Amino acid sequence: MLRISQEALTFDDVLLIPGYSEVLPKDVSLKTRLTRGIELNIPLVSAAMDTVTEARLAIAMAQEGGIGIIHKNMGIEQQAAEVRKVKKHETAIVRDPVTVTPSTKIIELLQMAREYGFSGFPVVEQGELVGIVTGRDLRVKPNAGDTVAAIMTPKDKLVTAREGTPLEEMKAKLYENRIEKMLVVDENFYLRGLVTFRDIEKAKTYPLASKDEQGRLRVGAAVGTGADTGERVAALVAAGVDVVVVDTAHGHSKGVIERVRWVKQTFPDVQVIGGNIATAEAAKALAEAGADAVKVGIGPGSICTTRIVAGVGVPQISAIANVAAALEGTGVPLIADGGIRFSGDLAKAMVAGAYCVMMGSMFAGTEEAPGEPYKGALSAIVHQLMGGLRAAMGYTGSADIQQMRTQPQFVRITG
Amino acid sequence: MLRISQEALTFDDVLLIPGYSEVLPKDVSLKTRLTRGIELNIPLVSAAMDTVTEARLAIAMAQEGGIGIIHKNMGIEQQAAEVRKVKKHETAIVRDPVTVTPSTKIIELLQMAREYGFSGFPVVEQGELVGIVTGRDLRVKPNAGDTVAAIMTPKDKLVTAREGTPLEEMKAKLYENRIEKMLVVDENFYLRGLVTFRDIEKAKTYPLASKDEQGRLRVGAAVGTGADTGERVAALVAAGVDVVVVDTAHGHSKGVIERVRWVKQTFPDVQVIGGNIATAEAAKALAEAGADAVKVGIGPGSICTTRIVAGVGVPQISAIANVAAALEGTGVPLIADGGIRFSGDLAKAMVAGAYCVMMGSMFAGTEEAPGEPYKGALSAIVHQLMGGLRAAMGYTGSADIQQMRTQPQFVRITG
Amino acid sequence: VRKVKKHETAIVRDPVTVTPSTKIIELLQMAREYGFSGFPVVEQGELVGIVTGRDLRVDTVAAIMTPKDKLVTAREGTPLEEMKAKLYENRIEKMLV
Ligand SMILES: Nc1ncnc2c1ncn2[C@@H]1O[C@H](COP(=O)(O)OP(=O)(O)OP(=O)(O)O)[C@@H](O)[C@H]1O
Ligand SMILES: Nc1ncnc2c1ncn2[C@@H]1O[C@H](COP(=O)(O)OP(=O)(O)OP(=O)(O)O)[C@@H](O)[C@H]1O
Ligand SMILES: Nc1ncnc2c1ncn2[C@@H]1O[C@H](COP(=O)(O)OP(=O)(O)OP(=O)(O)O)[C@@H](O)[C@H]1O
Ligand SMILES: Nc1ncnc2c1ncn2[C@@H]1O[C@H](COP(=O)(O)OP(=O)(O)OP(=O)(O)O)[C@@H](O)[C@H]1O
Ligand SMILES: Nc1ncnc2c1ncn2[C@@H]1O[C@H](COP(=O)(O)OP(=O)(O)OP(=O)(O)O)[C@@H](O)[C@H]1O
Ligand SMILES: Nc1ncnc2c1ncn2[C@@H]1O[C@H](COP(=O)(O)OP(=O)(O)OP(=O)(O)O)[C@@H](O)[C@H]1O
Ligand SMILES: [Mn+2]
Ligand SMILES: [Mn+2]
Ligand SMILES: [Mn+2]
Ligand SMILES: [Mn+2]
Ligand SMILES: [Mn+2]
Ligand SMILES: [Mn+2]
Numbered sequence: 001m002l003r004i005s006q007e008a009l010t011f012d013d014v015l016l017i018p019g020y021s022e023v024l025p026k027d028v029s030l031k032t033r034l035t036r037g038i039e040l041n042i043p044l045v046s047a048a049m050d051t052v053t054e055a056r057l058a059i060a061m062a063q064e065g066g067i068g069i070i071h072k073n074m075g076i077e078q079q080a081a082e083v084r085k086v087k088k089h090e091t092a093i094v095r096d097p098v099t100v101t102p103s104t105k106i107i108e109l110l111q112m113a114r115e116y117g118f119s120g121f122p123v124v125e126q127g128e129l130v131g132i133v134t135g136r137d138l139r140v141k142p143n144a145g146d147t148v149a150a151i152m153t154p155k156d157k158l159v160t161a162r163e164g165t166p167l168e169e170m171k172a173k174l175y176e177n178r179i180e181k182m183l184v185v186d187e188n189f190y191l192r193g194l195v196t197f198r199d200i201e202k203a204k205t206y207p208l209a210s211k212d213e214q215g216r217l218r219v220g221a222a223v224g225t226g227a228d229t230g231e232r233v234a235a236l237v238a239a240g241v242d243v244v245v246v247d248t249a250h251g252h253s254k255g256v257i258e259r260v261r262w263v264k265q266t267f268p269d270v271q272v273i274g275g276n277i278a279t280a281e282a283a284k285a286l287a288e289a290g291a292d293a294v295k296v297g298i299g300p301g302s303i304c305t306t307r308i309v310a311g312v313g314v315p316q317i318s319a320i321a322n323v324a325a326a327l328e329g330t331g332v333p334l335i336a337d338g339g340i341r342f343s344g345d346l347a348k349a350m351v352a353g354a355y356c357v358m359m360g361s362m363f364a365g366t367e368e369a370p371g372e373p374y375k376g377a378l379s380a381i382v383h384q385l386m387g388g389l390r391a392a393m394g395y396t397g398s399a400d401i402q403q404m405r406t407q408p409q410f411v412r413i414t415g
Numbered sequence: 416m417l418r419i420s421q422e423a424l425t426f427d428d429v430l431l432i433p434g435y436s437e438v439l440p441k442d443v444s445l446k447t448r449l450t451r452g453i454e455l456n457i458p459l460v461s462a463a464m465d466t467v468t469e470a471r472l473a474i475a476m477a478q479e480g481g482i483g484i485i486h487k488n489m490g491i492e493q494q495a496a497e498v499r500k501v502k503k504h505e506t507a508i509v510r511d512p513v514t515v516t517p518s519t520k521i522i523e524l525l526q527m528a529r530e531y532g533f534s535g536f537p538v539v540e541q542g543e544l545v546g547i548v549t550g551r552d553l554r555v556k557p558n559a560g561d562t563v564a565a566i567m568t569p570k571d572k573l574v575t576a577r578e579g580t581p582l583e584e585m586k587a588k589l590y591e592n593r594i595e596k597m598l599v600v601d602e603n604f605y606l607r608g609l610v611t612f613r614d615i616e617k618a619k620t621y622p623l624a625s626k627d628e629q630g631r632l633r634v635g636a637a638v639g640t641g642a643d644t645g646e647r648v649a650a651l652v653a654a655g656v657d658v659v660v661v662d663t664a665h666g667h668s669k670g671v672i673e674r675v676r677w678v679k680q681t682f683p684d685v686q687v688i689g690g691n692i693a694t695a696e697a698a699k700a701l702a703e704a705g706a707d708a709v710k711v712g713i714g715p716g717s718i719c720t721t722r723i724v725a726g727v728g729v730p731q732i733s734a735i736a737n738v739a740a741a742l743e744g745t746g747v748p749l750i751a752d753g754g755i756r757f758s759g760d761l762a763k764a765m766v767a768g769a770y771c772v773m774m775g776s777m778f779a780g781t782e783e784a785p786g787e788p789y790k791g792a793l794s795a796i797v798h799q800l801m802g803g804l805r806a807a808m809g810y811t812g813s814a815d816i817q818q819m820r821t822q823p824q825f826v827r828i829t830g
Numbered sequence: 831v832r833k834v835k836k837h838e839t840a841i842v843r844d845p846v847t848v849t850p851s852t853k854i855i856e857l858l859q860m861a862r863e864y865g866f867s868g869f870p871v872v873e874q875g876e877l878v879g880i881v882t883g884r885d886l887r888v889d890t891v892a893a894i895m896t897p898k899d900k901l902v903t904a905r906e907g908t909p910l911e912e913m914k915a916k917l918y919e920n921r922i923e924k925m926l927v
Contacts, residue, residue: 009417011726014419015423015714015722015726015727015728015729015730016725016726016727016728017420017693017694017727017729018665018667018692018693018694018697018713018727018729019667019694020667020668020696020697020700021665021667021668021669022668022669317417318417321416321417322417324416325416342723342724342726343723343724343725343726344722344723344724344725344726344727345726346726347725347726347727348726351418352417387724388724388725388726391724391725391727392725392726392727394665395665395713395725395727396727397667397668408418409418409419409420410417410418410419410420411419411420411421411422411423411728411729411730411733412419412421412422412423413422413423413425413730414422414424414425414428414730415427415428415830
């Protein structure tokens with residue numbers, strides 16, 4: 001008459017059993033679903049933390065084939081402006097470069113300059129492009145009580161490209177005119193972007209980039225429950241957010257359920273994820289409320305505060321599986337959120353039933369993450385992660401993710 | 416509806432239960448099979464790693480009663496030349512000693528000399544033996560613009576032995592002529608070997624030495640899958656290799672199966688091992704393909720990258736047993752490859768069902784291993800290993816290996 | 831010693847040169863050892879152009895060099911402040927004396 005439901009397993013309790021395999025790791029397909037209406041080419045999502053996902057990494061994740069969820073620890077208008085950044089981003093275009101103006105004194109220019117760590121500035125007048133100044137233009141004082149009009153390259157010169165021009169054509173003109181900056185303009189010669197030679201010499205055609213119907217990069221955003229949530233969700237949906245995540249510690253509650261329903265009935269053109277949960281019953285509740293995806297993870301970390309401060313949690317491998325089984329015929333995907341420290345874990349989560357996995361601290365050290373163990377680019381981490389998934393998929397003989405989630409088997413281990 | 420096949424046990428989960436015992440450790444028989452057509456006097460095989468098995472250790476292992484598998488991390492002709500070394504090796508004979516020539520200047524001799532760390536050189540002419548020079552010959556310049564012809568011991572002198580002469584007769588003549596070098600010659604007086612007094616004063620009659628039908632030391636070699644494999648296997652079989660090991664991370668695959676079959680149908684006079692595997696189904700696949708032995712081991716190490724980077728593996732004790740059971744009536748042996756850190760483990764593997772065990776890092780520090788914790792001679796390690804096996808065999812009352820593999824029992828333990 | 835004695839402070843006497851002719855693969859290869867890019871292009875004494883870093887971001891130097899009918903030269907001893915003046919107005923870094 002002690003009330004134990006079951007024995008629950010985490011990642012370190014199980015291993016994947018190798019199977020007959022005809023497809024090589026490099027040839028398996030990693031494409032999956034984030035929500036019933038959103039598809040990722042890789043099963044990766046970055047977590048909604050101020051140390052992890054803002055616009056900068058959100059972009060990176062979208063380009064890599066996954067998605068980022070902007071964190072809410074910031075003003076409403078700030079969070080929506082991050083969503084704007086990601087939704088409006090083109091590869092290497094600064095679409096809002098720092099500018100100057102014919103009448104800005106050269107004293108101000110040197111000052112700016114210094115403050116920013118670069119020297120190239122388009123000269124504008126109420127949006128109209130009228131000239132450009134750079135480092136070369138500044139190598140002599142004509143003698144300084146004078147302005148950018150005096151040293152800038154005048155309008156009649158100026159190499160320009162229209163907005164939406166391929167980088168190649170764009171690269172070609174920079175070299176042929178032996179210059180380093182390309183000014184993007186529109187049909188009225190208003191300045192729409194800056195594109196540098198240095199920025200073109202990097203970063204691909206991301207053929208996996210997760211894009212919306214309009215060819216813009218996908219992004220999500222977190223929201224809590226209570227009072228500003230409705231106002232918050234509204235600004236985020238106005239910003240063009242693809243998916244709204246109702247992100248909480250206890251997803252199996254009146255307040256979370258009600259809010260997921262409220263979102264899905266008020267903003268019918270967004271996708272809604274509901275979370276965190278860890279049981280079958282919780283899963284069915286969010287599905288009924290109309291959740292487009294369900295997020296799985298309560299006390300999934302052995303030292304995490306949920307376990308230790310509250311004595312609450314469910315080992316992730318059994319949580320995921322219990323939720324997977326619950327959502328069977330629904331078409332509602334599940335995301336595995338927490339407790340993954342190695343790429344082996346990511347494979348295990350997938351075979352347990354996840355459609356893709358959310359990660360926090362993996363990405364937290366990265367070059368893209370906010371501010372300032374600095375792990376360098378997100379490229380290497382994401383590549384290693386998928387590297388291991390593919391290896392796992394090779395061993396088990398799973399050609400794609402549907403198969404990986406449904407067919408391989410585990411051995412239970414001890415120590 | 417979480418998909419667990421079973422609970423799997425590793426070495427630290429079990430212990431051997433002592434039984435009625437009439438034969439002492441020193442009196443049990445350790446002879447076993449490596450492949451259906453190759454017999455070892457001890458159940459030891461050294462692993463195919465650039466840090467472990469090249470010709471030098473391959474020899475040592477053969478002489479000790481086991482076998483070595485030359486690694487593939489080298490050019491095709493290089494790997495085959497290692498196989499040649501082992502297959503052509505006689506105890507203490509340098510069969511390709513460094514030589515000189517009547518006309519090599521004494522400047523060159525002193526130089527060589529230094530470079531090599533020894534001073535004794537047979538003097539030859541297109542294979543014909545014509546004289547010898549050593550340290551004593553070099554203790555005065557007659558005055559150096561002159562050659563080895565001038566200081567060497569002439570042909571008419573020269574103690575020689577024909578090739579294939581016992582070391583005793585050979586030792587006897589060295590002492591009686593009070594000299595340190597024996598020159599081996601053939602029926603035309605062509606130089607076939609050098610045999611030193613220092614080299615005779617060491618190393619036995621290895622009565623356990625694993626030899627082929629022609630009395631040459633046995634050796635194996637690893638090969639992968641893909642493109643040069645066919646060419647590689649061909650040069651290795653031309654080199655006289657006893658056994659070809661198709662050594663891969665995932666043995667239960669189209670590519671490995673197909674290649675094992677290809678080898679066994681193209682080179683019918685070699686033995687073929689197929690690997691790594693960890694399930695019963697995998698075992699049956701390689702047996703069907705015609706494997707002469709099967710190698711067992713996937714993620715057998717608690718920290719190993721397979722487990723951690725890919726989340727894949729099967730604890731070795733259950734892998735071995737599951738494979739043993741599968742190969743029952745076939746006559747196809749199984750080799751246990753990975754996860755052994757103490758000699759107790761080696762006994763456990765044997766009782767679990769292995770015919771012999773492959774080891775890597777055990778031998779990796781050794782004097783024979785490639786280059787440069789230096790563990791000294793392979794003798795001591797191999798002796799300690801078998802020491803513990805014999806003790807285990809004493810406790811369980813197993814007079815030989817067939818019995819050890821089939822009769823004793825385990826207790827399951829906890830911590 | 832000659833190396834020092836041939837140093838002005840900066841007019842550089844005896845500069846490293848190249849030819850249209852010399853392969854583009856080899857340029858790039860200099861380039862990298864010498865330090866510095868930028869080489870007055872010469873045939874057999876006569877100045878026929880100039881090749882700097884900007885010309886290289888793209889078989890002979892003939893295709894990518896900056897040609898004679900476009901070179902900014904200054905005759906010797908033009909003072910240095912006059913020479914800087916001209917360098918500024920052409921928005922270039924190297925003056926050929
Ligand atoms: N006005 C600006 N506003 C926003 N971003 C800028 C601006 N100017 C430069 N950047 C960013 O900084 C990068 C480097 O600027 P910088 O002026 O150093 O380029 P550059 O003159 O081409 O340098 P280099 O001569 O080494 O190629 C650009 O590629 C761009 O990403
Ligand atoms: N798109 C453009 N059209 C016309 N002129 C330009 C353009 N971009 C830059 N310039 C002009 O070309 C000259 C060189 O500018 P650029 O920015 O390429 O080099 P820089 O970064 O100033 O030089 P450096 O790399 O040596 O510091 C300057 O006079 C600048 O005003
Ligand atoms: N020409 C050679 N080619 C290959 N190996 C050699 C050659 N000469 C010597 N060795 C190896 O080096 C060992 C020692 O050579 P060294 O010349 O020191 O012998 P040594 O003169 O008999 O020494 P000591 O006088 O101490 O007995 C030999 O036993 C042999 O294994
Ligand atoms: N097989 C042989 N037949 C005839 N003479 C030999 C033979 N081997 C060596 N000698 C000669 O015997 C002499 C002594 O040679 P040996 O190699 O035994 O001693 P060493 O190593 O030169 O002397 P030490 O050990 O003091 O350095 C030399 O003149 C050498 O040329
Ligand atoms: N072809 C050459 N032969 C000999 N000396 C040279 C040559 N080119 C440059 N130098 C000298 O070595 C230095 C190399 O600098 P570099 O050629 O990079 O100048 P730069 O391109 O004008 O530099 P920056 O772009 O940073 O202003 C120059 O200051 C010059 O004194
Ligand atoms: N004396 C000159 N006359 C005519 N053109 C020149 C002269 N010197 C350089 N150029 C040309 O001007 C352009 C840039 O040359 P410059 O040496 O000023 O740039 P750079 O050394 O490549 O500077 P960075 O690498 O810092 O951009 C090239 O097209 C080059 O051929
Ligand atoms: Mn610049
Ligand atoms: Mn530059
Ligand atoms: Mn000696
Ligand atoms: Mn001696
Ligand atoms: Mn320069
Ligand atoms: Mn410059």
